[PDB]
């Protein structure tokens, strides 16, 4: 499944870029390895954006 | 904290966990013994090489408390030995089996409250501070420690008392189940060190099932199922086909002896007797628990026995770490560690106005 | 540098990696021509040019020491670069070792698998031996050319892929095979197969 | 939504002060 | 637009193609200007090939 | 006022031909981020000058406020002035300059001032060494062409291929100096023999002061390069059935 | 409302299926409506007029060709349609009877002799 | 590990400042903030509601690009929902935009210029951004031949 | 208010006006329908768009019918 | 200054002649959309022409931002007007144009710029043969 995974991570890159997603490639990375196990993305749209904010304020 | 600084103790049924909040790992665990002259209530080193003029008991044996001097002797050791502070600047997070009584919750927190003297304290359900670790809210948490066990509904911050199930199986239930197959098969048990190793063995080298009837199959036409332990005390032993079969009594209950429920028609009868509303909104995220994944691979039974009790119109959305084990005392140390959750802490105020009994009430 | 990058540009004998490095360094000097659109409409001030005056050193040491090197002896000579522990040197390395790498992987993807590179300078390590109708052909019609081996290739990298290079080639022209470490090692085990 | 609202009641009574579709 | 000379590139070729085709035609009636404008068909650019391919679907109706 | 404000121009001048003179291979590739990391105070140094241009440019400069914005950075840039001209005295090389970097961060613990500023230049200086380190601990290699490393490679095997050069080690790491050697030569043994060279930690290695993530890792790849080792002889190619077959 | 959703509400409204039965139509018509949005030919009412006025000449209704002059009346005295060209002219293309050339009737100019 | 997935993605969005204490914080903020929502084909579709925004302001193909895509990953649908979140992260040339000069078939089409006061938009975004490069390389400069010392310094606290 | 009823008031007669003009040109279109349409056209919007999707939808509904 | 800048203007003079006249019937079939594929460069080079006198028309442009601008078109340019002398300086018609041009689709494979110029003119060249 690694290999189509890869592959399906790849062509997920672009729709965001031209869509201009806030979401870096490395996040990318990290969220459809966390999808694929089976998580809820409508709570994932929560945490990002108030870790973010978070992350920020030690700045 | 940020005003009054929070500590965190999990006293578990095989070892003592105790650190301060805000702590990823807990600062000291030591195994959970209690003295007793047959040198004087210790815990650690000393009490388990002292076994022939000490008494082994243990404080916490199902998720009841079978003698509350023994619990006041290691709540007392572990705060005074393996922490070492001050309580007047500390309040702790004590620890609780889920469905327990309220006449044994007032006497703990009257007891701690009293006899040791805190500022403020809480009194909490583990599976619940389990479930707070894996980020959701709500969730059925199926939880198998060394000795306590109970699959727990939870709901938005509530639990439904009805359907909160206690279960019979744990890892005593384990260790005797060891011995027992053992002697079946035949093998000598004459002291303690006999069950510890034992125990080590189930925990280290023994395959954790998924069907009877699939791996005894495969095992049946050729074993190669087998794996090879050479010891240095003097033994050969080395048996692939009861070391499948002996995680294998949680599948069917008659493999042990035991009348009591298997594990999926225990988180049926739990999932059936809880809201039918919050079924779905349960299932949108199941939760694995227990320290029984000392070998992993209970992991795939949690998730496969998940998909099959709740109706799929979705992908199952399980989440399955490897913090298991320890998830009731990280949920604790992040909990306790916030300053919101000082709202949720009940104080000395409280206790002198309204009695101790709102333990019962304020928490669940 | 601008005497060193336009002279270089005509050179049909600085092969295509100086054609390379060559474009590198054009595109870095139109970056210091940026500087003279902004300071001239502004128009001792010390301070403003003492930090070109440290990326202009660097840019002097990697053209005047590379000077008389082509191929994977200019490969390996702005790869003399990296093997440093200046941290804003190694930097401004690598936006000319990637430039004039890729004609030399290019070459290693004609002599890893099918093709052949042919020209008057070899900018690669194959020296291929002109009309040879005869079998000695085994290492007697690609010679190691030991000089424009890069930096990035050991004794053992350069010299095992010559015998992944040559093999293939062989089989296609003599065998009627004929068509129309990352990577070394599956190749090395595909052409041994193949042979 | 001006649809949604559109669909308001209004008296059976016009007026003789006013004109300009009284409602 | 520098005297809108870039915007005067795209015909002048049009114009020219349409300047040629109505210099050669003379006195050409019936299929002697059938095989007088198919000998620009045969021309190798494909921006002009197209156009006048097009004016002879119109002329040989 | 005029001599007050000059010891300043003073020890700048002694702080640019460290620069112009540790960019130098020859001179060393440790002693590169040293000089790369001298480079970031002189930028400080350049906006200081360069602020007082605009008050100048209006008159609102003179000697006695140019005096009082200068005393900060008068105490700071000597000490600059300090370490340079005693590193260019004598060819200091890999871990020696590291130690003489490790001896400015405990000759002053009064202010503090100044040691901050030396613990910066060492843990930046720690940058280019600290990936040599990062290849003989985890592997049985070393590559580093300038060789100014604490453990030189030799072309000649058990004790002759690496040897500890006693005149390249850093004071912070002569307690843990043998280990280095220790567990670098396990995997590189067993690397002789086909097998494994990887040691599964192999992350980037940190300097700190009184705390700890060097004394660590070493350990961290000691209790795997001397395991796998005797697993390796244990059971393959037997130790075992040597033993008792002499 | 924003337009996108307002087109699935109209592709809910000709088809009785909902935007869970299909998805194809409705990213038809996010084909063809968008990069072709807001009007960029003639949009003066009059022009629409002089066009349902020839349609019920042809149906030879003269009573209803002066009922809708009393229409397009009352829609000048309150003027609240924002735009009246285009219902208008979508309502003339969908019409159809309720029982040779024909491009030297009116047109909307097209305005690509204009740079707009 | 999804218990350590989530300690991977706060070391992403964690930068150069410590590092290993804010990593311990960060790993709560992210459970902490995961149960706050919950106490207080349509997937495809919600795409074409993006679709619609591109088509808009011009860049049709790109659209029609961004659709065949989505037909191939639906030919997964848990990505799309943190894809659409956002669709701006940005500040706080072609032959074949138009084909009038070359081509092969070409009607002709007369002017409008229409399409070429697009195309010297085209051109004046280049101008405005290689000017804004060279307003952020004069910022630079100005911020240090003029300011106090202490603004930004770390020298002068010694 | 009052004001933006007296609003509500000439946007519920333009309706109906516009509702007689539909009936005698016999679009397809009921009230429902056309109340989509309204919206579209004060957003701005190509009826020669517009006009093709309606002859496109209901060429899909009567080979689905 | 002016001197520097003169070359990209050579490079310019020598390739519109060669687009009018071998787009003749006279050369080629090759020759006619190799010159009509040299019209699509030549759209750069009079845009570029157009922005920076409109900008100078405002006071908004002076000839150091020129020079600081066209150094990309000083190399692709160059090329350009290599390949139209090369293709003006033998006889060559058809497939001997279209060797001259695989020798050139070599010259640069490297440079990745200089390459690209030939990779798209070579196709587009070659429609009718």
Not at chain 2, 11 to 20: L, V
Not at chain 2, 320 to 336: D, H
Not at chain 5, 28 to 40: D, I, M, Q, W
Not at chain 8, 43 to 66: E, Q
Request: charged letters at 25%.
């Amino acid at each position: 499944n690694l290999n189509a995974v890869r592959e399906t991570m790849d062509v997920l890159l672009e729709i965001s870029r031209i869509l201009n997603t806030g979401l870096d490639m490395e996040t990318l990375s990290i969220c459809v390895r966390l999808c694929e196990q089976g998580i809820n993305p409508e709570a994932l749209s929560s945490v990002i954006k108030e870790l973010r904010k978070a992350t920020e304020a030690l700045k | 904290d940020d005003d009054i600084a929070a500590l965190v103790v999990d006293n578990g049924s095989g070892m003592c966990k105790a650190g301060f909040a805000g702590d990823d790992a807990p600062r000291a665990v030591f195994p959970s013994i209690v003295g007793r002259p047959r040198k004087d209530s210790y815990v650690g080193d000393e009490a388990q090489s002292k076994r022939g003029i000490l008494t082994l008991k243990y404080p916490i044996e199902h998720g009841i408390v079978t003698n509350w001097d023994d619990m006041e002797k290691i709540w007392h050791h572990t705060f005074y030995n393996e922490l070492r502070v001050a309580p007047e600047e500390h309040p702790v997070l004590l620890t609780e089996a889920p469905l327990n009584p309220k006449a044994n919750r007032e006497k703990m927190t009257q007891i701690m409250f009293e006899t040791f003297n805190t500022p403020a304290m809480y009194v909490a359900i583990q599976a619940v501070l389990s479930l707070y670790a894996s980020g959701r809210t709500t969730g059925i948490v199926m939880d198998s420690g060394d000795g306590v066990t109970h699959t727990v509904p939870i709901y938005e911050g509530y639990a439904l008392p009805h359907a909160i199930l206690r279960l019979d199986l744990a890892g005593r239930d384990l260790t005797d189940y060891l011995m027992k197959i053992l002697t079946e098969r035949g093998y000598s048990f004459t002291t303690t060190a006999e069950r510890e190793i034992v125990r080590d063995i189930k925990e280290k080298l023994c395959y954790v099932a998924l069907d009877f009837e699939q791996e005894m199959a495969t095992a049946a036409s050729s074993s190669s199922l087998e794996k090879s332990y050479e010891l240095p005390d003097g033994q050969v032993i080395t048996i692939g086909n009861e070391r499948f079969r002996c995680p294998e009594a949680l599948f069917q209950p008659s493999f042990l002896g035991m009348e009591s429920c298997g594990i999926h028609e225990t988180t049926f009868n739990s999932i059936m007797k809880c809201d039918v509303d919050i079924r779905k909104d349960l299932y949108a995220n199941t939760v694995l628990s227990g320290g029984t994944t000392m070998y992993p691979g209970i992991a795939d039974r949690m998730q496969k026995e998940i998909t099959a009790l709740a109706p799929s119109t979705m992908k199952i959305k399980i989440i399955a770490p490897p913090e298991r084990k320890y998830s009731v005392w990280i949920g604790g140390s992040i909990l306790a560690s916030l300053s919101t959750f000082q709202q949720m802490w009940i104080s000395k105020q409280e206790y002198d106005e309204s009695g101790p009994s709102i333990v019962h009430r304020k928490c669940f | 540098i601008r005497r060193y990058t336009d002279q270089r540009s005509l050179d049909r004998s600085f092969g295509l990696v100086g054609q390379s490095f060559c474009a590198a360094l054009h595109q870095e000097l139109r970056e210091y021509y940026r500087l003279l659109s902004v300071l001239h409409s502004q128009l001792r001030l010390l301070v403003w040019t003492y930090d070109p005056k440290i990326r202009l050193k660097t840019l002097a040491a990697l053209v005047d020491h590379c000077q008389g090197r082509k191929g994977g002896e200019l490969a390996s000579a702005v790869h003399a670069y990296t093997k440093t522990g200046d941290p804003y040197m190694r930097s401004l390395v690598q936006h000319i070792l990637s430039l004039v790498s890729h004609p030399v992987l290019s070459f290693l993807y004609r002599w890893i698998y099918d093709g052949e590179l042919e020209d008057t300078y070899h900018e690669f390590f194959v020296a291929s031996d002109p009309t040879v109708k005869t079998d000695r052909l085994w290492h007697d019609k690609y010679t190691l050319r030991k000089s424009m081996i890069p930096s990035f290739m050991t004794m053992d990298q350069s010299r095992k892929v010559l015998l992944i290079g040559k093999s293939i080639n062989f089989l296609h022209q003599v065998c009627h095979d004929q068509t129309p470490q990352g990577k070394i090692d599956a190749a090395y085990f595909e052409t041994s197969k193949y042979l | 939504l001006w649809e949604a609202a559109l669909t308001y009641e209004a008296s059976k009574r016009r007026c003789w002060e006013r004109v300009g579709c009284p409602p | 637009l520098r005297r809108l000379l870039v915007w005067t590139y795209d015909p002048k070729i049009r114009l020219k193609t349409l300047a040629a085709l109505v210099d050669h035609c003379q006195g050409r009636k019936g299929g002697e200007l059938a095989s007088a404008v198919h000998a620009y068909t045969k021309t190798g650019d494909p921006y002009m090939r197209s156009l006048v391919q097009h004016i002879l679907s119109l002329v040989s109706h | 006022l005029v001599h007050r404000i000059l010891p300043v121009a003073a020890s700048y001048s002694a702080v640019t031909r460290f620069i112009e003179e540790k960019s130098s291979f020859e001179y060393g590739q440790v002693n590169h981020a040293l000089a790369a990391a001298m480079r970031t105070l002189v930028k400080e140094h350049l906006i200081l000058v360069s602020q007082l241009e605009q008050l100048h440019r209006q008159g609102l400069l003179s000697l006695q406020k140019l005096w009082f914005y200068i005393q900060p950075a008068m105490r700071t840039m000597d000490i600059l002035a300090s370490l340079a001209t005693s590193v260019d005295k004598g060819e200091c090389l890999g871990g020696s300059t590291l130690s003489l970097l490790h001896d400015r961060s405990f000759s002053y613990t009064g202010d503090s001032q100044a040691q901050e500023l030396c613990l910066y230049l060492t843990k930046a200086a720690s940058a280019p060494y600290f990936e040599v380190l990062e290849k003989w601990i985890y592997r049985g290699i070393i590559h580093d062409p300038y060789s100014e490393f604490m453990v030189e490679e030799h072309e000649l095997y058990w004790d002759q291929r690496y040897t500890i050069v006693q005149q390249q080690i850093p004071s912070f790491l002569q307690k843990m100096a043998d280990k280095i050697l220790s567990t670098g030569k396990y995997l590189n043994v067993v690397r002789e023999c086909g097998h494994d060279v990887t040691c599964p930690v192999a992350k980037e290695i940190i300097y700190t002061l009184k705390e700890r993530a060097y004394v660590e890792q070493i350990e961290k790849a000691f209790n795997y390069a001397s395991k796998v080792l005797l697993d390796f002889l244990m059971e393959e190619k037997e130790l075992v059935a040597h033993l008792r077959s002499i | 409302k924003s337009p996108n959703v307002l087109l699935q509400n109209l592709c809910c409204r000709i088809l009785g299926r909902s935007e869970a039965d299909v998805a194809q139509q409705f990213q038809y018509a996010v084909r063809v409506i968008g990069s072709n949005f807001a009007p960029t030919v003639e949009r003066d009412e009059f022009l629409v007029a002089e066009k349902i006025k020839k349609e019920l000449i042809r149906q030879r209704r003269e009573a209803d060709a002066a009922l809708f002059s009393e229409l397009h009346r009352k829609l000048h005295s309150q003027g609240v349609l924002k735009n009246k060209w285009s219902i208008l002219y979508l309502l003339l293309s969908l019409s159809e009877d309720p029982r040779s050339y024909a491009t030297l009737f009116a047109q909307a100019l097209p305005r690509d002799a204009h740079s707009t | 590990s999804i218990t350590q997935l989530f300690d991977d993605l706060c070391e992403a969005l964690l930068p150069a400042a410590n590092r290993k204490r804010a990593k311990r914080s960060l790993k709560k903020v992210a459970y902490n903030a995961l149960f706050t929502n919950l106490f207080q084909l349509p997937a495809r579709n919600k795409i074409l509601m993006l679709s619609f925004d591109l088509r808009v302001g011009g860049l049709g193909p790109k659209a029609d690009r961004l659709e065949e895509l989505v037909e191939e990953l639906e030919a997964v649908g848990s990505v799309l929902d943190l894809l659409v979140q956002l669709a701006g992260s940005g500040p706080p040339r072609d032959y074949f935009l138009n084909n009038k000069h070359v081509g092969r078939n070409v009607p002709y089409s007369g002017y409008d210029c229409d399409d070429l006061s697009v195309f010297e938009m085209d051109v004046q975004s280049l101008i405005s951004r290689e000017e804004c490069l060279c307003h952020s390389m004069i910022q630079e400069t100005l911020q240090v031949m003029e300011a106090a010392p202490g603004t930004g310094l770390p020298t002068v606290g010694l």
